[PDB]
XYZ file of C-alpha atoms in Angstrom:
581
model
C -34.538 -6.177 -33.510
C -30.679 -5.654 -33.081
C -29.051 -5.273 -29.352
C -25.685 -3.962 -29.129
C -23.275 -6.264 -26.489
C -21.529 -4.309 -23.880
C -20.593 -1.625 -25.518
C -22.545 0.647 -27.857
C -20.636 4.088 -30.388
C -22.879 6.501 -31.193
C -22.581 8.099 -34.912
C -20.746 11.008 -34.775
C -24.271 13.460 -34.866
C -26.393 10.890 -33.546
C -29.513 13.097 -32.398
C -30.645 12.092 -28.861
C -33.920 10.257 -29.960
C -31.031 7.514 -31.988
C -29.016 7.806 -28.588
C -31.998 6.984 -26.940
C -32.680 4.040 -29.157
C -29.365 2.795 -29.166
C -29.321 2.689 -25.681
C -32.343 1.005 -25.219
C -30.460 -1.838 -27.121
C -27.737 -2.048 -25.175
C -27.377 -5.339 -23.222
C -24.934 -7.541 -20.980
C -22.559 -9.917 -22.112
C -23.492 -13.649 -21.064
C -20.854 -13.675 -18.128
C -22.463 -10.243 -17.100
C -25.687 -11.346 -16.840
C -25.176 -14.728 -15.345
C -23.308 -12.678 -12.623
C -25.892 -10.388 -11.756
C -28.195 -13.397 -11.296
C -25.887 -13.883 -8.311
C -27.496 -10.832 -6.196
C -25.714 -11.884 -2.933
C -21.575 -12.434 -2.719
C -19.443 -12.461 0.212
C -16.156 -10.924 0.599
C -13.379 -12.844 2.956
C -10.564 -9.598 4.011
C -8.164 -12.283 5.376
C -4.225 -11.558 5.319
C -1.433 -10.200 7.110
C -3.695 -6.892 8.135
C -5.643 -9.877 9.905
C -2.727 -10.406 12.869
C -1.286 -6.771 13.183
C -4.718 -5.151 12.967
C -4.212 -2.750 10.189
C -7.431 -2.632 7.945
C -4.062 -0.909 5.114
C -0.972 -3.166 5.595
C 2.680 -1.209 4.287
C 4.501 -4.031 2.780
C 6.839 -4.106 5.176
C 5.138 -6.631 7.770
C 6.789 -9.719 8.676
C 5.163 -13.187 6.819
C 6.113 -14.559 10.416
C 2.984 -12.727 11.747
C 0.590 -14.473 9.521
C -0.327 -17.658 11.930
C -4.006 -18.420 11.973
C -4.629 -20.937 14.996
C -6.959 -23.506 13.809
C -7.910 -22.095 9.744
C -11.067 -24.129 8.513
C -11.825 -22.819 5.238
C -14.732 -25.244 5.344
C -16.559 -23.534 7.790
C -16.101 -20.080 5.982
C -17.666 -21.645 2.822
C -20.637 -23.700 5.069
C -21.774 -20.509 6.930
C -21.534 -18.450 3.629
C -24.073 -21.457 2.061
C -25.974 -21.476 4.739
C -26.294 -17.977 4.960
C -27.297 -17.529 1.256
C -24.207 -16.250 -0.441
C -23.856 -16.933 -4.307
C -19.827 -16.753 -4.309
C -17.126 -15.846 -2.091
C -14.670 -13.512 -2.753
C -11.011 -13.710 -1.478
C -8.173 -11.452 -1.065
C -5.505 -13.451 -2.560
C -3.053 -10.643 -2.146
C -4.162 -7.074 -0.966
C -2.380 -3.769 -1.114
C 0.047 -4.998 1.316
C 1.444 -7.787 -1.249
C 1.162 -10.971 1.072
C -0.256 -13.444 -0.722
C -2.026 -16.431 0.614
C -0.819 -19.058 -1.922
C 2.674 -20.228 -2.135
C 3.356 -17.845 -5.347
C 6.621 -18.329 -7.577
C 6.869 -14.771 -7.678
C 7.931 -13.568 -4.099
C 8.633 -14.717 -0.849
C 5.971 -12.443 0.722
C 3.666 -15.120 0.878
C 2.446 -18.126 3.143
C 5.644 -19.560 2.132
C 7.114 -17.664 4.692
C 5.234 -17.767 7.203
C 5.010 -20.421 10.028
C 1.374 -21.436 9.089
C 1.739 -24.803 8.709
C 5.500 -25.119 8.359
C 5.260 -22.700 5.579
C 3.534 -25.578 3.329
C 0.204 -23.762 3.497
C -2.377 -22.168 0.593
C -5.258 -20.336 2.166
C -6.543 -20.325 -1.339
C -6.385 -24.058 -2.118
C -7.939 -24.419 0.902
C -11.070 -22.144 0.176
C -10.784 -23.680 -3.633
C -11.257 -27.392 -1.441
C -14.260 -26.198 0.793
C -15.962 -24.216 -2.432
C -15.513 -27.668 -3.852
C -17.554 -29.940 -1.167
C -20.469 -26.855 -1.195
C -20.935 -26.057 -4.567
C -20.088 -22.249 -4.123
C -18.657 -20.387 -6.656
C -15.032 -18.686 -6.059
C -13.483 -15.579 -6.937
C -10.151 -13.622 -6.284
C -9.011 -10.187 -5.321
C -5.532 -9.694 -6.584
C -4.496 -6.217 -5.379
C -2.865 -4.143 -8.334
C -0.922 -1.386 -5.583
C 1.218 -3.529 -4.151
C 3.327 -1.946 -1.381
C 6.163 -4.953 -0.828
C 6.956 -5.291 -4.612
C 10.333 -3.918 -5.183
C 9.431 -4.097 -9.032
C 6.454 -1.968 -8.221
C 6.256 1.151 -10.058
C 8.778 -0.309 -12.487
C 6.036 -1.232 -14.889
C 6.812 -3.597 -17.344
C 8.668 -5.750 -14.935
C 5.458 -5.215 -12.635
C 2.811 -6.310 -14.965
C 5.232 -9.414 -16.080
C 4.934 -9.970 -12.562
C 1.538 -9.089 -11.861
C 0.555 -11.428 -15.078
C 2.248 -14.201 -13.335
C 0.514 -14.037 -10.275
C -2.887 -13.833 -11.794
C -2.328 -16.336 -14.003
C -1.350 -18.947 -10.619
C -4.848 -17.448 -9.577
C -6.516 -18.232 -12.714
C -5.006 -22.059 -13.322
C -4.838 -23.863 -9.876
C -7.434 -23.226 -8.057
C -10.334 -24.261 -11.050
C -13.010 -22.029 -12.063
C -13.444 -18.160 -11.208
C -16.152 -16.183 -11.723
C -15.193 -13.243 -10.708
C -12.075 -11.075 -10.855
C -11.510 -7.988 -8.461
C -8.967 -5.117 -9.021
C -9.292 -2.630 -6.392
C -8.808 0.911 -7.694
C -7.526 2.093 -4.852
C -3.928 3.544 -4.548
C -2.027 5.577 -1.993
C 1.069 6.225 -3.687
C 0.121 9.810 -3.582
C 1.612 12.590 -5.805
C 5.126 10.834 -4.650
C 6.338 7.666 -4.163
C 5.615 4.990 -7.037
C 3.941 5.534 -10.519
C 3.097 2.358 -12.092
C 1.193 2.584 -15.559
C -0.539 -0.978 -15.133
C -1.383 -3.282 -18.385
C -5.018 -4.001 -17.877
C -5.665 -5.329 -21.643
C -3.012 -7.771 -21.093
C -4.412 -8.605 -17.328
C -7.776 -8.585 -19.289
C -6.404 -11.374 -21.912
C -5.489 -13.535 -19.057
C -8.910 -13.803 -17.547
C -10.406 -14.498 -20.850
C -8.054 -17.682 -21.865
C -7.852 -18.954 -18.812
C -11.503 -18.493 -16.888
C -14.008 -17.919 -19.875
C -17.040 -17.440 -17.102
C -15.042 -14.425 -15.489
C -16.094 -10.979 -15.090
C -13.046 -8.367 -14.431
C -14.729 -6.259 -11.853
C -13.801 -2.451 -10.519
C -10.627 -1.589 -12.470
C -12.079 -4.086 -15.426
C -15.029 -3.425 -17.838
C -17.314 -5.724 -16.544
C -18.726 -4.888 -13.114
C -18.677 -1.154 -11.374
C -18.592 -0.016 -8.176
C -21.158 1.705 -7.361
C -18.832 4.829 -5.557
C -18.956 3.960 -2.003
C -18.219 1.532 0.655
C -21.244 2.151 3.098
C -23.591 -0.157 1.481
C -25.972 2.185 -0.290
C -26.782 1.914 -4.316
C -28.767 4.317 -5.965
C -32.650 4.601 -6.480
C -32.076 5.784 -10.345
C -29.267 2.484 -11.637
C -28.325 2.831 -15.324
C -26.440 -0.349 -16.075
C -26.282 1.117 -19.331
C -23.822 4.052 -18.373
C -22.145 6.811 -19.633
C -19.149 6.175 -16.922
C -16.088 5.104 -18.987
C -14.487 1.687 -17.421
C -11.196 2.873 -15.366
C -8.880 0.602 -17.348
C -9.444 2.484 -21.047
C -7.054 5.121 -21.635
C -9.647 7.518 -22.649
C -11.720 6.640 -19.252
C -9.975 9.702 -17.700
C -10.416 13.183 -19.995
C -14.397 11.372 -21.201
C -15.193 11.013 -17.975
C -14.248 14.300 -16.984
C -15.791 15.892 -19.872
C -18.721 14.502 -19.079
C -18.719 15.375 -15.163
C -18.711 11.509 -14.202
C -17.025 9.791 -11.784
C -17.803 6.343 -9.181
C -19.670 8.040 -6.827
C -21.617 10.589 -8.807
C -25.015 10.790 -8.967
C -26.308 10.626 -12.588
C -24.779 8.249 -14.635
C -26.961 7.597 -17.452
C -30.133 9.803 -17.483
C -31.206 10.944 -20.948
C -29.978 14.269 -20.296
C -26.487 12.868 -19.819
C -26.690 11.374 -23.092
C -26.501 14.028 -24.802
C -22.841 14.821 -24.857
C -21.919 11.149 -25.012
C -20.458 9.453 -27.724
C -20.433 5.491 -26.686
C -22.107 3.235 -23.655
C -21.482 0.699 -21.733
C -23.038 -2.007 -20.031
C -21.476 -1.691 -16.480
C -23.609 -3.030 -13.591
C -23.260 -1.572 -10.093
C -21.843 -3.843 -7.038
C -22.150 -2.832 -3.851
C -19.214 -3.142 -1.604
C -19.897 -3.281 2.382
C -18.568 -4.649 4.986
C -20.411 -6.586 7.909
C -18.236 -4.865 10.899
C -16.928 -1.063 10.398
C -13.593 -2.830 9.076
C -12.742 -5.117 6.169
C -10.709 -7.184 8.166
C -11.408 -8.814 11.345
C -10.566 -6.649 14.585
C -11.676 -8.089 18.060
C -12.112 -4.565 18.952
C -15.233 -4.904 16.627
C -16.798 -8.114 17.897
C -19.783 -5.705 19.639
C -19.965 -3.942 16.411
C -21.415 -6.122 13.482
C -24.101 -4.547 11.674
C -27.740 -4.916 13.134
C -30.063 -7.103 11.531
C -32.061 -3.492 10.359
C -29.194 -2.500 8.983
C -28.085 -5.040 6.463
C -31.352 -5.358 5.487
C -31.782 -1.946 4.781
C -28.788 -2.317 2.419
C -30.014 -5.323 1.118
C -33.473 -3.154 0.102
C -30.868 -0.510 -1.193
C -28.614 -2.635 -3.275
C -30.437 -5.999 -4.326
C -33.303 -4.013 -4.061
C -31.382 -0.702 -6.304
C -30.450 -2.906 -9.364
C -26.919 -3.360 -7.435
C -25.591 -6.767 -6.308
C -24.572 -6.838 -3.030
C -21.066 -8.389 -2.084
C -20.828 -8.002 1.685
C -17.649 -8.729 3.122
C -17.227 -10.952 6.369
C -13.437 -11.476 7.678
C -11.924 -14.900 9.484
C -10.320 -14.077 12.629
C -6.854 -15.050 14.268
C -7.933 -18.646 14.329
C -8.962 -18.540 10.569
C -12.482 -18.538 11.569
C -15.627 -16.713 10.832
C -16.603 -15.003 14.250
C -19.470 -16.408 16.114
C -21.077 -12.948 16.596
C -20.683 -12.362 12.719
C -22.511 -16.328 12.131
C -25.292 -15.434 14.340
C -26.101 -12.186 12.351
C -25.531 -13.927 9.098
C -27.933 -16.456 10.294
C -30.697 -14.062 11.758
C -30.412 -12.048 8.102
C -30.717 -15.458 6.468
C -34.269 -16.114 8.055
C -35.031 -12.843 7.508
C -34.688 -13.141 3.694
C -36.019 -16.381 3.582
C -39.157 -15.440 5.673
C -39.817 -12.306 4.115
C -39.432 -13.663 0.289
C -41.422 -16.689 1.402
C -44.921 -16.086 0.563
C -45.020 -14.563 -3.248
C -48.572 -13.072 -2.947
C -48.934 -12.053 -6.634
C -50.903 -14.720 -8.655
C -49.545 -14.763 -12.665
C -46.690 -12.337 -11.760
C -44.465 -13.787 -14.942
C -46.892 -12.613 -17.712
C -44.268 -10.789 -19.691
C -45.651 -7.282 -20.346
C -44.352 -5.282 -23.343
C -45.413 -1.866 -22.841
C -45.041 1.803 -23.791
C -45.003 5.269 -21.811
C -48.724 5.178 -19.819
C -48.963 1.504 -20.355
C -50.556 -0.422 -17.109
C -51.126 -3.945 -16.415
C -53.168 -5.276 -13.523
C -51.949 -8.627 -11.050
C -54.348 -10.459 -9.138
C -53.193 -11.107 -5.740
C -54.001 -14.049 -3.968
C -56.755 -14.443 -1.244
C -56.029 -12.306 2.215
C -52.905 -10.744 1.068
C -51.486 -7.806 3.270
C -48.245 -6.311 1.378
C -45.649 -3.992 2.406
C -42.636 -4.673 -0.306
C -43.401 -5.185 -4.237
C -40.546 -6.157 -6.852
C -40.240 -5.545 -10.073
C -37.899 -6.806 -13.274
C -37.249 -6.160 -16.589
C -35.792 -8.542 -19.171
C -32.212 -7.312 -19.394
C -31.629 -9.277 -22.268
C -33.049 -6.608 -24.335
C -31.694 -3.654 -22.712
C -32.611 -1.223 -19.618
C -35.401 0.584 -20.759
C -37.650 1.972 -17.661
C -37.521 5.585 -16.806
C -40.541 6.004 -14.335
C -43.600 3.928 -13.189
C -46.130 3.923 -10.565
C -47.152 0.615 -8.373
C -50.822 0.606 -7.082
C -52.695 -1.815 -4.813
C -56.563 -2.192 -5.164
C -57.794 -1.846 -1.573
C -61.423 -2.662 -0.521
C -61.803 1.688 -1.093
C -59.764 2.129 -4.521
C -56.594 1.962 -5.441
C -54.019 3.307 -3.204
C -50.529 4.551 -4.772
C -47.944 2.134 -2.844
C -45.173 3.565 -4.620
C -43.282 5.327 -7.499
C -39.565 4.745 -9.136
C -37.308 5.250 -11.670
C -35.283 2.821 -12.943
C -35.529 -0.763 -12.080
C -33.328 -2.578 -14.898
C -32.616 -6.434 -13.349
C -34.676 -6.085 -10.181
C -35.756 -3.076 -7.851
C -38.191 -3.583 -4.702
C -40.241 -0.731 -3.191
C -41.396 -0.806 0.329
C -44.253 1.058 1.955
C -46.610 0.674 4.410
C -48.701 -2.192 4.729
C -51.734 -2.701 2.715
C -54.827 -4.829 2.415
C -54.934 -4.983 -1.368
C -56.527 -7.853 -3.985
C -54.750 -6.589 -6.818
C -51.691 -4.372 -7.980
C -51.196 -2.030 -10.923
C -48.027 -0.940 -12.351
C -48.032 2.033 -14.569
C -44.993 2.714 -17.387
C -45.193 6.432 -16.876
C -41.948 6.593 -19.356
C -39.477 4.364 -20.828
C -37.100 4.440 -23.517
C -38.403 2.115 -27.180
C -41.236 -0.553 -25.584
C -40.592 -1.462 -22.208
C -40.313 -5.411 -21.550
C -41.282 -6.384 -17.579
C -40.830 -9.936 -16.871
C -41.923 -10.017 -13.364
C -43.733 -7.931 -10.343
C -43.945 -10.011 -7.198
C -45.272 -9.073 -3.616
C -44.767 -9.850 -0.307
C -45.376 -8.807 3.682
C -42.107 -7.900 4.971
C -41.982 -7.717 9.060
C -40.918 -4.276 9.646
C -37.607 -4.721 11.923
C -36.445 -2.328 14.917
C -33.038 -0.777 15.294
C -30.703 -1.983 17.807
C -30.846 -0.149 21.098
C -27.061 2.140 21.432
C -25.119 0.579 23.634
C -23.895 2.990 26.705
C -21.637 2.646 29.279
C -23.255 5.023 31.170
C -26.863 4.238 31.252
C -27.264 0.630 33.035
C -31.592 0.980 32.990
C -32.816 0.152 29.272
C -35.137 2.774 28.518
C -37.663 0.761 27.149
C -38.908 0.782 30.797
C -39.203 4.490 30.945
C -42.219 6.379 30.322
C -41.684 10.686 29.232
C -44.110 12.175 32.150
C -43.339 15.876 30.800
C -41.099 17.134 27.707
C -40.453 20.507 29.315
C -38.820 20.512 32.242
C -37.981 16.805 31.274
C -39.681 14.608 33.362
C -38.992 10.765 33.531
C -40.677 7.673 34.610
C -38.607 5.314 35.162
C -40.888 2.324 35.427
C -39.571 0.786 38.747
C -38.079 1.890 42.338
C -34.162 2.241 41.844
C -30.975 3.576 43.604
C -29.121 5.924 41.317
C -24.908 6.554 41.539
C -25.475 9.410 38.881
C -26.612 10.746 35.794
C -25.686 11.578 32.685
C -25.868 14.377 30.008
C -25.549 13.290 26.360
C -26.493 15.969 24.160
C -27.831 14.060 20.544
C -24.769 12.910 18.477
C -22.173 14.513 20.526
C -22.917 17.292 18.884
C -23.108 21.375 19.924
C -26.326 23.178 19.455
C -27.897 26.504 20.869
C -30.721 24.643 22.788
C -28.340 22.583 25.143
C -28.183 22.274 28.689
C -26.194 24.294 30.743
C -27.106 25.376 33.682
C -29.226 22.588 35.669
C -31.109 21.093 38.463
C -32.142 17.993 39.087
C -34.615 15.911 40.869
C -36.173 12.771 41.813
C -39.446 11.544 43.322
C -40.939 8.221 43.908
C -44.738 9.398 43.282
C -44.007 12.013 40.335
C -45.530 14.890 42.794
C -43.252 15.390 45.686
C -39.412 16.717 44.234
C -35.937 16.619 45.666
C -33.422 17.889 44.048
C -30.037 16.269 44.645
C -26.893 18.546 45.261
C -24.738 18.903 42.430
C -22.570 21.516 40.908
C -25.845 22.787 38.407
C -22.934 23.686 35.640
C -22.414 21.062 32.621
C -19.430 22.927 32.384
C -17.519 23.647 28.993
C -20.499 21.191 27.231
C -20.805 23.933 24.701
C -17.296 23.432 23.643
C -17.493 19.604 24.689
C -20.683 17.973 23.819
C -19.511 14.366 24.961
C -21.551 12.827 27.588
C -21.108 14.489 31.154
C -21.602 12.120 34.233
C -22.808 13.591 37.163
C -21.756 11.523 40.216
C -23.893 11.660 43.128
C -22.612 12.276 46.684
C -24.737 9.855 47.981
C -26.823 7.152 46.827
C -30.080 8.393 45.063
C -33.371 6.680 45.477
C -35.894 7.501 42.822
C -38.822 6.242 41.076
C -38.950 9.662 38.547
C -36.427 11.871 37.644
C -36.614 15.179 36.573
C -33.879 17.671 34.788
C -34.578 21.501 34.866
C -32.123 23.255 32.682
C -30.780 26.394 30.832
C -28.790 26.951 28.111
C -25.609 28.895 27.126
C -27.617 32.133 26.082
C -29.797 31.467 29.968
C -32.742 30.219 26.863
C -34.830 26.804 28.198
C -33.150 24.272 27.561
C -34.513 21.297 25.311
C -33.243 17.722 26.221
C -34.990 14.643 25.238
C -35.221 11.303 26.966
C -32.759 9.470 25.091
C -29.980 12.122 26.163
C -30.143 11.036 29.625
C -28.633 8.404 31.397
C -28.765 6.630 35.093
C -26.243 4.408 36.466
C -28.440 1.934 38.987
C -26.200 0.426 41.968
């Protein structure tokens, strides 16, 4: 048994059954694998963009700016421990071309800046707090860079680009990980540079052997979006040409692949493919709408629901997750973003407490129809199963089938595709003494080295904050969906209410034309004076505040209402709004 590292050629009329094979043999470097072991990384967006609140700096922004009050790279690297993070990821230099280490290469640096009398490194300091925890570093060096003037001149810039890296690479110990951003807004004008990424490439390797060269490198995708989502069907063995070969552009058009697609490695796929590569997905997300920090988001960090449903849909997808958390203006982690890295922490840590398979590491070598049967242990209720395959030997899964053994049969708990280094399936929860996974197709003899179980508490959204609804619907009871009726759940004194048709969004069943009401036993109806006319809501569908003339007493409330086309209305609870006095 032969496996092919990294990179696999095809014959030149290889039938799709030696494809097939071949693929199936196609595994990850050491470095690759060891970084997909990580699972969880955290990004630090910290620069100029930072103090003048530009999430794309221009290269023209004056070092003088960059001024953190009170930087403690230490308590970055303590909350990212603490939090679970395997390595954290900084941006050295970004697009902008400030760099946070004193460089030899440019002025546009810390060097300039009044940070510390100019004396400072952001990066030693990181390198010095990674040191005390034990965390694992890596560096985003930003190939567009808009302050160079030898940008775009490319020989001169990858000389220069070399040299920066290489600072990177030699002072600051070991890196694990090496991040060149794709991502370039030159445009069809402005500058053209024709970067040497072989030569970048032969950097990393001589002077950080454990490195992986991630998005524009060979080593680690992207997975073709920034919104936190991987895909159900992962082939880490891919058709999709690394960026940085010179071929990666006509082979991947010929083969109608690019980041984002959806099908990059499906036997179909194969067929007009001539090589493969072992290139694992990473998930890029950030924990606020932004990379870097803006006060503006302090009310905006991502729910606990949220980043654990992209948690599910990255760790979970075969995808490592590197979520990106920014220091502030006083070179600190937020206290809104530690609390949410805290409560998704616990979260994790109570939900993969309990392992409730018994024997779960029998490694099962299997082909298409194969099953094998796992004892749970005694009382188990399960909502989330997870499943590996020894990567070692290739990605070989194609479908299966996950059953739990209830006290009336088996139930099916879930199906999948893929699931490569690790994929978790969640479903509702089940009373269950044992769980069967079927192969229902796989490429050569699948090899699964672990299924594992567990009760997940199911999590609620966060409620939409809205300026103008003060009375949390959680008190309200619906009384009547047609004409909307309300319960409020107490005795209040309403200045108004509002309109706010579902996503601020136009649709046929609106409300126009309206009355409204209120009661304090649900029986006997008022209606309070208003105008009756949302008026221009069809070509406006942003919330519409209807201020009372006088102060409203009211227990219920009730809208009657009419449409554009004089149709009833349809308006649901959570489109209406009271302000209480």
């Amino acid at each position: 048994e032969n496996y092919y590292v990294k990179h696999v050629e095809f014959p030149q009329s290889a039938t799709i059954e030696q494809k097939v094979d071949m693929a199936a043999r196609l595994v990850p470097t050491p470095q690759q694998y060891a970084w997909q072991q990580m699972e969880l990384t955290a990004f630090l967006h910290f620069g100029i963009n930072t103090f003048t609140g530009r999430e794309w700096g221009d290269g023209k922004e004056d070092p003088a700016l960059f001024n953190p009050s009170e930087l403690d790279a230490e308590q970055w690297v303590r909350t990212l421990k603490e939090a679970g993070f395997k390595m954290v990821l900084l941006t050295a230099k970004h697009h902008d071309g400030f760099c946070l280490w004193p460089t030899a290469t440019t002025k546009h640096s810390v060097a300039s800046s009044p940070w510390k009398n100019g004396q400072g490194d952001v990066v030693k300091e990181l390198r010095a707090a990674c040191d005390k925890y034990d965390m694992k570093f890596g560096v985003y060096l930003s190939p567009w860079d808009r302050n160079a003037e030898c940008y775009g001149d490319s020989p001169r810039y990858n000389d220069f680009f070399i040299r920066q890296l290489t600072e990177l690479l030699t002072n600051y110990g070991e890196v694990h990980e090496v991040w060149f951003d794709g991502a370039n807004g030159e445009g069809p004008n402005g500058k053209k540079q024709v970067y040497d990424w072989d030569a970048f490439y032969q950097t990393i390797q001589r002077l950080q052997p454990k490195a992986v060269m991630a998005i524009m490198g060979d080593d680690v995708r992207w997975v073709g979006n920034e919104k936190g989502v991987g895909r159900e069907t992962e082939w880490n063995a891919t058709v999709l040409t690394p960026g940085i070969y010179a071929r990666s552009q006509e082979n991947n058009k010929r083969l109608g692949v690019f980041s984002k697609a959806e099908d990059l490695g499906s036997r179909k796929i194969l067929e007009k493919a001539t090589e493969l590569f072992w290139y694992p997905s990473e998930v890029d997300v950030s924990i606020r709408p932004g990379w870097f920090y803006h006060a503006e988001e302090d009310g905006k960090v991502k729910s606990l629901k949220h980043l654990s449903d992209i948690y599910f849909q990255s760790v979970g997808y075969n995808s490592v997750l590197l979520l990106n958390i920014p220091p502030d203006r006083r070179g600190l982690i937020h206290e809104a973003d530690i609390k949410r890295l805290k409560e998704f922490a616990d979260y994790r840590q109570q939900t993969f407490a309990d392992n409730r398979v018994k024997n779960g590491r029998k490694y099962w070598s299997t082909t298409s129809g194969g099953e094998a049967v796992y004892a749970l242990k005694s009382k188990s209720e399960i909502n989330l199963v997870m499943l590996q395959e020894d990567i070692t030997k290739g990605q070989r899964v194609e479908a299966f089938t996950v059953e739990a053994l209830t006290d009336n049969g088996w139930k099916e708990v879930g199906k999948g595709t893929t699931i490569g280094y690790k994929r978790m399936l969640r479903f509702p929860a089940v009373n269950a003494n044992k769980l069967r996974v079927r192969i229902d197709e796989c490429r050569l003899t699948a090899y699964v080295s672990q299924v594992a179980a567990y009760y997940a508490e199911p999590l609620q959204e966060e409620t939409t904050k809205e300026d103008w609804n003060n009375l949390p619907r959680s008190g309200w009871k619906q009384v009547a969906a047609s004409p909307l009726t309300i319960d409020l759940g107490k005795t209040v004194t309403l200045s108004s209410f509002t309109y706010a048709p579902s996503k601020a969004e136009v649709k046929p069943t609106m409300a126009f034309r309206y009355q409204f009401f209120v009661s304090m036993d649900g029986k006997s109806w008022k209606e309070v004076p208003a105008s009756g006319e949302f008026s221009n809501i069809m070509h406006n569908p942003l919330p519409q505040t209807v201020a009372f003339s006088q102060k409203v007493q009211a227990r219920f409330i009730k809208l009657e209402a009419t449409t554009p086309d004089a149709t009833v209305a349809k308006v649901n609870m959570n489109e209406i709004g009271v302000m209480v006095i």
